[PDB]
Design a binder for these strands. Structure first.
Lengths: 244, 244
DNA sequence: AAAGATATCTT
DNA sequence: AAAGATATCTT
């Protein structure tokens, strides 16, 4: 399938290539910084060609946002199935010690999930699947040798700000949790668990319908959630009583 | 001086090299995307070596944030004078056309400017200067970046995601404006003007004291601001009334 | 403008 | 956790 071929290719590319810097047209190389801002950027650019190659083999065209700040990162679709678009978003997080628990921010809960055409490349009802390509890396402190420029002949000598990168491919609803991933930027929170839980799909929602109803009615602050629901147990009781 | 040698080195490096992609240790090159999210990261990595080299020349140690949401990007200081630290932040923005007015977000107005040790690498009162390295790029019309990978002999074939890039170094207070640069993330706004105004330092504040006081008492919403001040003239009237 | 989107993190 | 920080853009 498209999905199995895509995760096979991402997993393989991760295993064989290690990004180590930015390069200029003149051949000068600039080492990488330690942020997640930097590594989130690197992993998106590293995935781009892979996604395009696999999409093309299943006759899918790839469209990136035409305007800035529009989800998703990549929109796939066959011209013969305009209302069966696939949204792919790349998300990255870190780990201090290898294999500690991790969690991701899964997109806003107040934009396209509550308004069909808000901050999204195509109307939300034209997508039949929302996939997350998740990258996890173990942080590695920066040192003196990262603050100089390098030539092409010193490629393998450049120090990297990470180690043990892992990648998964999973549906957004499947790995979604019941607690916000951010406050003022109102994002959905993923489950808080080990990498294997993301791969296997051990989330808290029973269906994609339950995921959507939960986040579509989740209040923004603790003061408002106090009288409604703060977690999945409370939501299921709220539902049991008649949405009250 | 440190400042004049830094500005010269930045202009020079910018004039000489054009960043065109990310490179792996194995030699495979992945092209860059169009975003400001991609370009802000690229301009930050590009400036690193320059800043470290010039600082070493003048005998300053350079420290990057150990924590991830702490300002500033680069802290310069001599071991002899620990209360004479210099903060350097790299900021990016775009233009559609060469001579179109631009604007920057200049950091939060509710963190370290209101709390000495909040979201800052070293206590705010240890810093004697706050510089902005501003990068302005001209967007390319193309909306479809390259989705293939390249080798080291194909560097001049890689499409660049910008038409032209300009850089400046200026004090934060000098280019600060009186209108918020962001709402929910409460950022100071810069003046809205042509590139030359930033270089020449044609701001609206009469002093750094006035800039700090303005942003330290700026209310977060229109509702609250309409009873106090929304702009520089209203703030100066607010001062006349007795800070009430 | 003002307010809230874009991704992810600390305390 | 919840709430508001990190940078920047568009509605």
């Amino acid at each position: 399938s498209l999905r199995s071929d895509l995760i096979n290719a991402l997993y393989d590319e991760n295993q064989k290539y290690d990004v180590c810097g930015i390069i200029s047209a003149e051949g000068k190389i600039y080492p990488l910084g330690s942020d997640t801002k930097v590594l989130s950027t690197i992993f998106e650019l590293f995935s781009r060609p892979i996604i395009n190659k696999i999409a093309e083999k299943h006759g899918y065209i790839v469209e990136e946002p035409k305007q800035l700040n529009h989800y998703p990162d990549f929109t796939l679709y066959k011209p013969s199935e305009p209302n069966k678009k696939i949204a792919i978003d790349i998300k990255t997080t870190y780990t201090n010690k290898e294999n500690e628990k991790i969690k991701f921010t899964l997109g806003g809960y107040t934009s396209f999930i509550r308004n069909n055409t808000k901050n999204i490349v195509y109307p939300f009802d034209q997508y039949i699947a929302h996939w997350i390509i998740g990258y996890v890396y173990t942080r590695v402190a920066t040192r003196k040798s990262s603050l100089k420029t390098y030539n092409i002949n010193e490629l393998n000598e450049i120090p990297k700000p990470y180690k043990g990168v892992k990648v998964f491919l999973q549906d957004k609803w499947v790995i979604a949790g019941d607690l916000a991933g951010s406050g003022n930027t109102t994002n959905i929170g993923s489950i808080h668990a080990h990498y294997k839980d993301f791969v296997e799909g051990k989330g808290i929602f029973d269906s994609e319908d339950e995921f959507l109803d939960y986040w579509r009615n989740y209040e923004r602050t603790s003061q408002l959630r106090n009288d409604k629901y703060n977690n999945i147990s409370e939501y299921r009781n709220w539902i049991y009583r008649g949405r009250k």
